[PDB]
Amino acid sequence: PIVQNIQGQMVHQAISPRTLNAWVKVVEEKAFSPEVIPMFSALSEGATPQDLNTMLNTVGGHQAAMQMLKETINEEAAEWDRVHPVHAGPIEPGQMREPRGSDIAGTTSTLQEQIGWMTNNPPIPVGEIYKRWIILGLNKIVRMYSPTSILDIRQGPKEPFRDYVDRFYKTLRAEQASQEVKNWMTETLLVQNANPDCKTILKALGPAATLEEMMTACQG
Amino acid sequence: PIVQNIQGQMVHQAISPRTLNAWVKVVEEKAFSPEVIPMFSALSEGATPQDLNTMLNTVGGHQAAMQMLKETINEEAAEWDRVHPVHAGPIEPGQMREPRGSDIAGTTSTLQEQIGWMTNNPPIPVGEIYKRWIILGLNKIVRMYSPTSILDIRQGPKEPFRDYVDRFYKTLRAEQASQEVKNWMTETLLVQNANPDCKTILKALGPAATLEEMMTACQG
Amino acid sequence: PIVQNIQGQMVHQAISPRTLNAWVKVVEEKAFSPEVIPMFSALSEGATPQDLNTMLNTVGGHQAAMQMLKETINEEAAEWDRVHPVHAGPIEPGQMREPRGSDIAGTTSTLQEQIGWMTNNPPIPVGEIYKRWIILGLNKIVRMYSPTSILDIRQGPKEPFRDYVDRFYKTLRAEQASQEVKNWMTETLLVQNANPDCKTILKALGPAATLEEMMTACQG
């Protein structure tokens, strides 16, 4: 990644083996939870595209998700190349060339070019765009990983409300929807597929109530 | 997080994977206990709000408590933006914008803005307020996760006194009772809900019994 | 903990996560052992009262022992406040006020107050006093947690002599007594509850003999 030394100039520090060790171990141990992508965001803070490529390639198994994320990367690179033209000519000092989709992906680029692109003024967030593409691919993978849909979960006769709402939110973290409609979902589907006794309890208490008072009323 | 160098000038540092792995193990390992709130307050000391958001998003399971803490964060942010109005329209040169309800948590604010806010003169303790809000949320969570009320604790005919008083003090620390009423009830409910033989033995000692006397006399 | 080093001494660093994790592991794994007092004295060498409070709050289980420690600390703080009364009237400018009985425990004080108290000229060692309070509480805890008394220790016909004396000295170290009676009680209790063969051996050796010859006499 990129770090700043105390009273020093911006220099690029090498990758940490312990980070890759934790990253390879956590994905295998935790399978594919939604939080895995978030975990990815914390481990790849300010990392170069080569670091993300190595982190993705070092994962053992799950080559289908790797092929899917590679296809999404190729599609995003093609879209970026189509929306942003490419110019050629002499390279003036202090100004970098036009980054291409193959250069944004980092498959046909080197380390020094990426370092010069990320340390220029103004900085070109190539690593940030690549990280956004990777987390979008991971979101797609975790959505495909979801066994039960958001509308297929229903509270059973003997299943408690705590585990019910826990599984409901776990499935909601893995469905495909925007935040605006996600709010309506987590508002109405939580009371539409609940236990009938607690359904009547919440209807008597009020739909606009928060989750805390609803749970405290459903427990009693 | 935030570290202090020997020179005197501090710099930004990314979240270390070791602390995140330790937090995940503690959460997985102990579920929820009144002792995890000090663990979180001592582990995330001097950390950016983005680090706390990543730590709260990387947890696996128990999404009910996560939704509870999110709702408490939203309510605290609403109260903050209601009690602190933006009376100053224009912004002076060199001064950063005031943290709003959504900016204090880090939803629509980048890390650079948080760094500039926390390193201001005088500094703006946004991270401290966020940590206090998370502590209040975890307090509410551990209060809800209480198995039963404080009055239902009754020592059985063959249940020992050690585990009895341990569970009693556990559910008392997990209770939302104030410091005065806790000290008022710890002198009555401990002696009124004990084994009858021991209960009479402790009552025959006097009204100035200490914890060590209660432990050494009940066990005889 | 406080960091007294080269120029730049004005610095306060929170407790390291590794030391706190090691403390949690040694508390969870070994419960309470006669060696936990040196462990606490080594892990909390020169720490601020807030650090001691955070270490005492992260303990898992054994709420009765923690309540005993808290009440002993409160009693000793009351005794300190009684023996060291606070002077009334206005305080002198530039002179830090003397820490009160409750200020040592860190229940009604802040971080800056104890930082200025420990870094004053001359420094006020309130942290050492709090550590003494905690180790006295731990001594009371390990004395209360004694399962078997010292007089109920008798070696069986098959139990080895080395394990017998190890258990005896462990139980003796778990109990706190004056130094002038322990050297007599060990000699008047060890050579009486041994194996008949080892008893005849030690009678053939001598009462006033050392312990190494007793260990190497009845070995095997």
Next chain:
Amino acid sequence: PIVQNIQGQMVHQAISPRTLNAWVKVVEEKAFSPEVIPMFSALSEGATPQDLNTMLNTVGGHQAAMQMLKETINEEAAEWDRVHPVHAGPIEPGQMREPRGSDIAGTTSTLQEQIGWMTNNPPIPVGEIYKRWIILGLNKIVRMYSPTSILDIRQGPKEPFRDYVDRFYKTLRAEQASQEVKNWMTETLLVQNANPDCKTILKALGPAATLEEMMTACQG
């Protein structure tokens, strides 16, 4: 590995114990898979030839693969010496001699020689060449270590489609070939060895469709 940083570049640090211990543990645990190639490339970012020799000597077992890697490195060094002949006669003063074919492997060279060759102006990327040699060796190793060919992969009546395509892509990644025929072989082999239900599903969908729709089609 060599460290290029702030003033004081004339430094050389040996291989860290955490890196070497992790590499030996990961290679034994993961045996041989295509995945090791990026892990080795990330662990040896900017390392000295002696560091690569130590990393290749630390591995235990699988002597045949190590001998194959050594003979491939020797053949490639002979080819480099044939294509880059060394100039005869006396060398110019102050100009470092070009690295010979055997000097790249580090068998007849010292530490100061490669230090001067890497810190020269302009630098000579001999370490990158040796890393490419080791990467080609590992490619040949993982190509010869393939237990089952790509054509002998057929999904059983009860084996899931996801696991089938995962095994297929793992076997395809284990083998190295031109991507222009890979694009054709994956499409002419994936949709031929599936279950009859998934086969008729993909026939109703279409051959020119993407892979994610095939994954989400025959799921469950």
Next chain:
Amino acid sequence: PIVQNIQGQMVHQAISPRTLNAWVKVVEEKAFSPEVIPMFSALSEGATPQDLNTMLNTVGGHQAAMQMLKETINEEAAEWDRVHPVHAGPIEPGQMREPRGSDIAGTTSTLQEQIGWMTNNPPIPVGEIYKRWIILGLNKIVRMYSPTSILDIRQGPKEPFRDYVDRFYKTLRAEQASQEVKNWMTETLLVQNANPDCKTILKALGPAATLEEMMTACQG
């Protein structure tokens, strides 16, 4: 222990929590091996008497051995106090007082006095003397702990010569003897208590043969 900062004055660093964790762990994990003593010499390089006392007292179990080593420490302190007189009077700056036996033991001394005694000119190796006493006590305990004597080991009919000489050297490392006579045992008894076939082989080869060639002759 004591460390020297880069271009700084001699400062005292606190105890190492990770090293202490290892030390407590090694004793339990390794049982009681003779190699444990060097272990202490490597982990306690330049350690203070207070740190040594904490490391001794933090050990769980072996209370009999702890009492024995404490008795040896008391005897050494009494011998030191008897061989070196003690003088009293005004303490001049730059010169410390005469250390007593209890002061060398560290039971009645403090950290500042220990630092002043170890950082004087010329330095008083109080820590070195205490470490020598501790390693002598550990040598005594490992001599008493030896189950089989040095003269009781004999090569069996089916016991390999490698294991025989390994156990012989393990018993020689734990036996009590001087450095000069130590060679006599490994030169005479090693060939006098072996299998008759290799006995005759070594007698025909020559007594002055070394261990390597004598074993290669005994193996064949």
Next chain:
Amino acid sequence: PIVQNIQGQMVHQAISPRTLNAWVKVVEEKAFSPEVIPMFSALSEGATPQDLNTMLNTVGGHQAAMQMLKETINEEAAEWDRVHPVHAGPIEPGQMREPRGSDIAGTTSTLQEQIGWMTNNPPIPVGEIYKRWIILGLNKIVRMYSPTSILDIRQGPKEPFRDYVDRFYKTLRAEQASQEVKNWMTETLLVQNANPDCKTILKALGPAATLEEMMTACQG
């Protein structure tokens, strides 16, 4: 060990417990094999002779090899003091004494003398010579620990060729034979002691067969 700071001046550092913990574990986990020598050479790089002595003393078990390496060190020191006589009687001011046979190993020499010797201008590579002697001793040890000779390696009737050639190269790497004779025998003994059908296939393939061709033909 010895570390190099960005300033330019190096200082002494105590042995880290992590390296020795790994060293004790690696010796026990990997037993004895060719790979132990490189690990040893890469882990103890730039360490004082006292650190290597402690590492050779903290090992648990296999005391025969320890005595072998001790006798090898003694013989090398004897040869050193025989070939390097002390012709200079007096010592110049500011210069330290020359390392003798017993001083080069650190038996009767303190750590300060070794520090002054290794930090001289020009430095005296005592640690490098000690490491070379230990490497020669370990080579002799792994040569002795060979289960069988190289000529006795013969593939069985049904034993696969992979493990056969693995054991062949394993017992050939530990052999003290020169590179020329090893390269001469690896072309003949590998094909002369193989499976008859495979042997005939490899002989009919031609006299210029390489490793990969033999691996691909012998398995068909």
